[PDB]
Design a protein around this ligand. Structure first.
Ligand SMILES: *[C@@H]1O[C@H](CO)[C@@H](O[C@@H]2O[C@H](CO)[C@@H](O[C@@H]3O[C@H](CO)[C@@H](O)[C@H](O)[C@@H]3O)[C@H](O)[C@H]2NC(C)=O)[C@H](O)[C@H]1NC(C)=O
Ligand SMILES: *[C@@H]1O[C@H](CO)[C@@H](O[C@@H]2O[C@H](CO)[C@@H](O[C@@H]3O[C@H](CO)[C@@H](O)[C@H](O)[C@@H]3O)[C@H](O)[C@H]2NC(C)=O)[C@H](O)[C@H]1NC(C)=O
Ligand SMILES: *[C@@H]1O[C@H](CO)[C@@H](O[C@@H]2O[C@H](CO)[C@@H](O[C@@H]3O[C@H](CO)[C@@H](O)[C@H](O)[C@@H]3O)[C@H](O)[C@H]2NC(C)=O)[C@H](O)[C@H]1NC(C)=O
Ligand SMILES: *[C@@H]1O[C@H](CO)[C@@H](O[C@@H]2O[C@H](CO)[C@@H](O[C@@H]3O[C@H](CO)[C@@H](O)[C@H](O)[C@@H]3O)[C@H](O)[C@H]2NC(C)=O)[C@H](O)[C@H]1NC(C)=O
Ligand SMILES: *[C@@H]1O[C@H](CO)[C@@H](O[C@@H]2O[C@H](CO)[C@@H](O[C@@H]3O[C@H](CO)[C@@H](O)[C@H](O)[C@@H]3O)[C@H](O)[C@H]2NC(C)=O)[C@H](O)[C@H]1NC(C)=O
Ligand SMILES: *[C@@H]1O[C@H](CO)[C@@H](O[C@@H]2O[C@H](CO)[C@@H](O)[C@H](O)[C@H]2NC(C)=O)[C@H](O)[C@H]1NC(C)=O
Ligand SMILES: *[C@@H]1O[C@H](CO)[C@@H](O[C@@H]2O[C@H](CO)[C@@H](O)[C@H](O)[C@H]2NC(C)=O)[C@H](O)[C@H]1NC(C)=O
Ligand SMILES: *[C@@H]1O[C@H](CO)[C@@H](O)[C@H](O)[C@H]1NC(C)=O
Ligand SMILES: *[C@@H]1O[C@H](CO)[C@@H](O)[C@H](O)[C@H]1NC(C)=O
Ligand SMILES: *[C@@H]1O[C@H](CO)[C@@H](O)[C@H](O)[C@H]1NC(C)=O
Lengths: 754, 92, 752, 99
């Protein structure tokens, strides 16, 4: 049962290391050269990474009868049994053996394996020199045999000694060409693969015992031509796989006898631009096939016949030009087709409708420009279409009639104008929905319309299809957000990247659906945040909860002058002034910026045209949408003010750059509170100011500047009273008595006037 | 070997190799096989051996890795007996 | 067809609104009987009146269709079924069903005239006193069912019909058996006798059953058997035994049959012992279950000669010890389960005999420990169930030979496991704890919700990249650090109710992209503030991260001020703690020296004496932040020390005290908060106006409880407080000694 | 130049529990840095199976490395031994098709 090393202490070298994993062992202790690993009676993996680790001095190890033995480049005796060489190992009945040498190629004969015959999976690699049918003759019930990377040539009669063997495979064997009968004696060869062997060409004589063959794989075998019946010599083959081979053409009808073929693969068949007609005809059955990446120029009218229907039949990257309608005729059904990267301006539609059942189809990367209606009307079964990277600008009104239950579409890098009126022909016939084929599309899982001339957004689609969760839009011609678009009651994800969006119209879309996570991306959209964005500005301003999610950092408002390249973080919503600013009555030297949040219009003038600036048209309440007002006269000398306060609808005054020379409380507005009143000159005061002074409207803040003041008895006590209410005074010292200049508290008035 | 390049797997007990320029810490009192690492070595002339089944510009290359320590062995000056800057797998 | 019969003078009809079906209200002359008819489904009718009077019914024959009447609608005795067929004549439908509820009839052959050819037959609550006559005309019969009934059977009754494919006798409460009752039936391979009271199995009672394949004993109070019962039935395929109070089988009971595929022995508590070599060389045997059987101990020689077993199930059985010679004969086995069994020590040299075993369940056994040699030759495990098995430890090389594992359900553990250090000697290596888990590369699911886990092992986030789900609730993990979290996978974690006292999270949370990690922390005695502020803000006001924390049922424990407080409502501004052991504070007061959110804090409000030095021991603010606060309030200091060299502080407090003057040297200019409230200020502090300075920190002087002398000298104090009233935290409390009123209300004319 | 089976290498911080330094003082001072340990795994597209631009192999697998960290048995009580693993490197390995 258990295995242990006999004398681990016999030599300082050859130290034993036993674990439940494997009785690990190696002769050199600190720097092992030979290595041995046996786990339990099943696999003995060992190696001799250097010649001096001679097995001659190796101690005998009571190896049990394991079923697998592996030898890795260990030194091998000369014309002697492997077991005899490894007398120090006692594996009685091994079932599978492996060998791989980085050096020491050896001629192979029977005497090497005269003790090793009860074996099933023999495999040599990197060191095969010659077979000569000597070794393989003395074997029985072999299961698998393999050679690898040996650069060898064989006599035809070598393998014929053993008639039956389940599998054989040769890779990197470096055979110049198959001998006519190299594997002649094959009876049980279920599958053979020659992947890497630059075979010169193929001859039918090399193919014998073909009945056992079921699979055959070729990878890089640099052949150019084939015999007229080398593959027609058999039918028992089930799977065939040829790739990466430099053959320019094929004989016609090379598989007519091979009617029992299930799967064929022919990919990256370079130098292959054309195929023989009828070659795949009479193929009474076939599971799958792909011919992609071969660059085939043109095809016969119907290459395939006899098969009830195949699954893949893909020809992507074969840059096809003309597609005859006569194919698919033998195939009433087919699951999936791909013809991408093919020079196709338009498929002849009736070829497509020849089949009815269909899964996903791909026609992208083609030069597709026109799309006929009669290509999908009977296409009842259909999945997503991959048609992007095509010169597409128009589509039929309703082309999904066959499959209204389509899930996804990816129209990218096309030029679909898709304007609102582009579809809608009879304007009064359809009102809510244009005649987009979205009405046919009752559902659309994912849509990819980025990089297309998307002139118009269609909210009807939300009603045309009700199963929509991820919308892909970029490089689109939408001028701005559309009203009432969030109304889908599903977790739509949307992208607005590199799209000419200037204004957000979503206040009409302001409606939250329960358990909905709407998503939009805001990238390279030339927003003009000047007007009609304040509600949206605050909505995105710390959006605590919203069904819609945004990508704002990817955006930066630029269209407003001050708000140039201004992302939200830079942006302050309180400075959003509507762009129009045109009451059509404000002075030319002046400007009127209505504030949406304040319900006021910033009455800011310019130019200092004249000191006596007449009162602004305050009664114009901007169509009564802004009753409260604010007068912010900028850069103007001022002497003319509203007498009797004919305009009480203002609480803000500026008096910037004013050259003031007068004062009158009746001239002073009452409801006006926040008055800068810069550049002052008053050295006196009228006591009626306090009678007018009443901050009920707002904080009556005043900032007297550049002011020459004469401090005398009536005004001094008045300033004392006002300092008692100095909460509305910018600075007490702003008085700064023009003759002297001092503090109101310091001065006493009895001495001044007694 | 279903892998890309032939390789050598060894379990040497190294004697002198350091991330810094000083392996003297490990040149004294390592005679009881204190440590052993399954060092993998690529096939000789790895650069001259691009991967089979491929012809990429990137042929087989052998990288490195480290293993520091704090463990107290049976010697005085052993800040870390675990070996550092050790060769690693070979791949294209 | 005639799904809606016509209405006419002789007998009208009314087709109810159903396509291809119809509620046959066709008579409609009185709501006496209501009929429901489909194209072929049923013709059964709500015969309200027990006397149907089919003659007084439209008698609408439509020929032999599979629809029938079974409910409540009967006929008088001694009458051919054709008389019952009066409403609808059929031509020997192969489907006949009837369920007699009101009574039970002899079901005579004379009674059965009109339906002879049949395939599906049903009888219910009757069949009493029936001769070997009705079976004569029922040729090509395949199915027969008996509902709840009661009648002893005459032997060889159904000899005429050997063609019956299926038989149903359940609920009959079959009393006894006779070797020869069924010998006239050979095509009978389906048979069930549940809800019966067969006392003993008569020797060869099942003889004369040439092709019997299915046998169902489900509710069968049986205690006695015989090998002769199953001797002749070598063609039997699968057998079921359930609810039989036998104690043991006779020897040689089952070796007679050969193509025995499946055996079920469920729920025989009386069954305590088994004969040796019960399953003697039956390669056909694939699935055998003995669950919930009070079997005492398993005899060694039971399954020799049979290797085709795929499922071996023992269930909740009283078995105690296992001889090693139970996997010997079965190189191939898929599932093994030994659940809720008094087994306490699995023999080590057991599992080597199989390689392809995939699962194992030893739930609630008494497995004191496990040997390493158990898992030598097993490369197919995906599950493992050792829930509450009295384990104590894990051998280090336990999973050496089991790499194919995917999931472990160690689960509830009525036991202990020292999960602290497998190897921690002076020779130990800090690379990774040498736990047996390092081998389990593809491991994904692991549960220990009950074990005495000392702490977490590193290798789980290192040597197990497939980890997906893990629980450690009700375990003994003291603390947690970020270095124990680098799992790089969407892993949910349950550590609630563990003794987590503190956690340490770096502020710079580094996560793999899209690493959704969810951890459950509730009912854990969590100390707060200390090294937790980064964690606190990580969880409190958590905006968005790949880390999620089920912390609803968690509460602060250690801070007495924040006792049992919810964390979410708590904030770092409330958090402070002291574990540097420095003697900086004078100890004459509360004398804080803690780090209140990256800010040294001192609170000497603990009854500070008058003129007590403000900072007798100022903090060097080493390895910390110079932001310092002093709290000396509620303390009677009618005069503060008002003398202190510049010290790195930003906050001062002095209430329930008083002041007479101030020194510029005493006041550093890096001050933000100065209380000077609730303290009398009678005199005019003239020097303060000189020391009034634009300090660096945000000055917030709450000068209050002041009763100055409103007069001309230093009257500019009003200008000082009014020029920057925002700095002045309060002006109303300034209420001069002569006239107590807010100074703002007093003008210069009042002053002078 | 890019290689087959791009893989992500990581410096995992060593055990920073430090025997629960919060056992007696709860003020952290573990702000320093140590060399850590370098581990590389191939989670490119969560181990994107086609490992190379060259393709020809749609499967690459991470590989551990076991190290016999002890044979000294310096405890003077038993031949203490131990094997430690870690996913040292990842590499591409071709498969064998059914055909
Ligand atoms: C010698 O070659 C033969 C093939 O000619 C090997 O038999 C095959 O061995 C492999 C693995 O050893 C088996 O693969 C497994 O098959 C089961 C079947 O269900 C599957 O579930 C597993 O996932 C796995 O793919 C394969 O089945 C088996 N062939 C047959 C027909 O069963 C044989 O193993 C080789 N010798 C040695 C020593 O390995
Ligand atoms: C090729 O033949 C079979 C597989 O196709 C492998 O098994 C061999 O089968 C032949 C029968 O054609 C056996 O010859 C005779 O078999 C009977 C019954 O086994 C035996 O009683 C006779 O004495 C005689 O041997 C042969 O023994 C059998 N050998 C083994 C190892 O199974 C055969 O190995 C394949 N290869 C060769 C070189 O025959
Ligand atoms: C209302 O209209 C007045 C026009 O009188 C606008 O005044 C203008 O404001 C801009 C602000 O960017 C001034 O430009 C900047 O002025 C500052 C002043 O120091 C200077 O440092 C900058 O380099 C830049 O030139 C502009 O000079 C000024 N012009 C006048 C004639 O006043 C005012 O901005 C308008 N109010 C708004 C837009 O809200
Ligand atoms: C007597 O009762 C038996 C009960 O098994 C009937 O046998 C089976 O009856 C079903 C429908 O009654 C036949 O159709 C089957 O339906 C299932 C479910 O849709 C479908 O999965 C099958 O593929 C098949 O279509 C079935 O063929 C039949 N035989 C079987 C299951 O072996 C029998 O038809 C009844 N006979 C009379 C005269 O009432
Ligand atoms: C773990 O939980 C995370 C959630 O944080 C899941 O996130 C998913 O992560 C994958 C890649 O790690 C994402 O796939 C890629 O996403 C980007 C952006 O979304 C997209 O541009 C790529 O084309 C690709 O689809 C996936 O979207 C993301 N799903 C989310 C965020 O909902 C992740 O699936 C979970 N599992 C693992 C193994 O990480
Ligand atoms: C059991 O079934 C067999 C056929 O499977 C029946 O035998 C048939 O009986 C009819 C009766 O007239 C003959 O016409 C057929 O020629 C017979 N065929 C065979 C193959 O024997 C047999 O009668 C059935 N036994 C019953 C119903 O008890
Ligand atoms: C959690 O573990 C504890 C102990 O580890 C279990 O409590 C008791 O454990 C002893 C161990 O000998 C048993 O004898 C008792 O029967 C257990 N008591 C109970 C009430 O079960 C406890 O059961 C475990 N809980 C879970 C859910 O596994
Ligand atoms: C979009 O499609 C056009 C079509 O030629 C292509 O040139 C362009 O690269 C694609 N992508 C973008 C971002 O425009
Ligand atoms: C959409 O997201 C919300 C949360 O924003 C969620 O409650 C809801 O379940 C999601 N929709 C669906 C269909 O799951
Ligand atoms: C108004 O005129 C004064 C006088 O020179 C000047 O100082 C001031 O800047 C002017 N204001 C503006 C807004 O130009």
């Amino acid at each position: 049962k258990r295995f242990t090393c006999p004398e681990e202490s016999e030599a300082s070298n050859c130290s034993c290391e036993e674990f439940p994993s494997k009785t690990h062992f190696y002769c050199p202790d600190f720097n092992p050269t030979l290595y041995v690993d046996v786990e339990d009676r099943m696999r003995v993996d060992f190696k001799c990474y250097d010649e001096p680790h001679d097995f001659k001095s190796l101690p005998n190890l009571a190896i049990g009868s394991v079923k697998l033995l592996t030898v890795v480049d260990c030194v091998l005796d000369d014309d002697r049994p492997i077991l005899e060489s490894f007398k120090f190992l006692e594996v009685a009945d091994v079932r599978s053996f492996v060998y791989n040498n980085h050096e020491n190629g050896i001629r192979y004969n029977a005497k090497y394996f005269e003790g090793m015959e009860q074996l099933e999976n023999l495999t040599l690699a990197r060191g095969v020199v010659s077979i000569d049918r000597d070794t393989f003759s003395g074997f029985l019930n072999l299961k698998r045999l393999t050679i690898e990377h040996n650069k060898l040539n064989l006599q035809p009669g070598t393998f014929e000694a053993l008639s039956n063997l389940t599998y054989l495979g040769l890779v990197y064997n470096g055979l110049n060409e198959i001998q006519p009968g190299l594997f002649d004696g094959l009876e049980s060869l279920e599958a053979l693969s020659l992947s890497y062997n630059d075979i010169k060409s193929l001859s039918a004589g090399s193919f014998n015992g073909l009945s056992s063959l079921r699979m055959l794989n070729l990878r890089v075998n640099k052949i150019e031509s084939f015999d007229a019946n080398t593959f027609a010599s058999l039918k028992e083959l089930s799977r065939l796989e040829i790739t990466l081979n430099p053959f320019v053409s094929l004989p016609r009808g090379l598989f007519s006898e091979n009617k029992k073929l299930k799967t064929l693969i022919l990919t990256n068949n370079r130098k292959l631009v054309t195929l023989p007609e009828e070659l795949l005809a009479n193929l009474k059955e076939l599971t799958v096939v792909n011919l992609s990446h071969n660059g085939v120029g043109n095809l016969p009218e119907s290459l395939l016949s006899g098969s009830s229907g195949i699954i893949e039949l893909n020809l992507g990257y074969n840059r096809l030009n003309s597609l005859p309608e006569e194919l698919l005729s033998d195939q009433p059904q087919l699951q999936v087709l791909n013809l991408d990267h093919n020079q196709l301006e338009s498929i002849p539609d009736y070829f497509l409708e020849r089949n009815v059942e269909l899964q996903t189809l791909y026609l992208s990367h083609n030069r597709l420009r026109s799309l006929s209606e009669k290509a999908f009307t009977k296409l009842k079964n259909l999945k997503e279409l991959h048609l992007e990277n095509n010169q597409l600008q128009t589509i039929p009104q309703f082309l999904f009639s066959g499959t209204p239950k389509l899930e996804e579409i990816y129209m990218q890098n096309n030029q679909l104008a898709l304007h609102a009126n582009s579809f809608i022909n009879e304007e009064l016939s359809i009102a809510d929905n244009d005649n987009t084929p979205f009405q046919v599309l009752q559902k659309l899982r994912i849509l990819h319309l980025r990089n297309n001339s998307i002139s118009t957004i269609f909210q009807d689609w939300y009603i045309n299809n009700l199963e929509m969760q991820s919308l892909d839009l970029s490089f689109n011609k939408l001028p701005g957000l559309s009203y009432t678009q969030l109304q889908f009651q599903s977790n739509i994800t949307l992208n607005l990247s590199n799209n000419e969006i200037s204004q957000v119209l979503l206040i009409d879309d302001l409606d939250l659906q329960p358990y909905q996570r709407i998503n939009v991306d805001l990238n390279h959209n030339p927003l003009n945040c000047n007007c009609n964005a304040l509600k949206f500005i605050q909505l995105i301003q710390s959006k605590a909860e919203h069904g819609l999610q945004f990508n704002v950092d990817q955006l930066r408002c630029s269209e407003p002058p001050n708000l140039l390249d201004a992302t939200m973080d830079q942006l302050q919503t309180k400075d959003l002034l509507c762009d129009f600013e045109s009451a059509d009555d404000c002075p030319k030297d002046c400007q009127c910026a209505m504030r949406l949040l304040d319900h006021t219009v910033i009455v800011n003038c310019s130019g200092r045209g004249l000191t006596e600036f007449p009162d602004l048209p305050i009664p114009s309440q901007l169509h009564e949408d802004f009753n409260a007002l604010e007068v912010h006269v900028e850069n103007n000398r001022l002497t003319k003010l509203p007498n009797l306060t004919k305009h009480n609808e203002i609480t803000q005054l500026y008096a910037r750059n004013n050259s003031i020379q007068n004062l009158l409380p009746h001239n002073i507005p009452s409801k006006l509170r926040i008055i800068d009143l810069s550049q002052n000159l008053l050295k006196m005061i009228d006591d009626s100011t306090l009678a007018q002074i009443n901050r009920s409207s707002h904080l009556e803040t005043i900032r007297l500047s550049q002011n020459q003041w004469l401090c005398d008895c009536p005004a001094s006590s008045f300033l004392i009273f006002v300092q008692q209410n100095s909460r509305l005074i910018s600075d007490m010292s702003a008085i700064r008595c023009h003759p002297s200049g001092k503090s109101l508290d310091s001065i006493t008035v009895n001495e001044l006037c007694f | 070997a279903p892998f890309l390049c032939e390789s050598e797997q060894l379990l040497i007990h190294p004697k002198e190799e350091l991330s810094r320029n000083n392996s003297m810490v490990w040149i004294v009192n390592t005679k009881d096989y204190k440590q052993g690492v399954r060092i993998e070595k690529c096939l000789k002339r790895q650069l001259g051996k691009p991967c089979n089944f491929c012809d990429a510009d990137t042929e087989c290359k052998q990288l490195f890795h480290y293993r520091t320590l704090v463990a107290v062995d049976k010697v005085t000056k052993k800040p870390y007996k675990e070996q550092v800057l050790l060769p690693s797998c070979c791949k294209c």
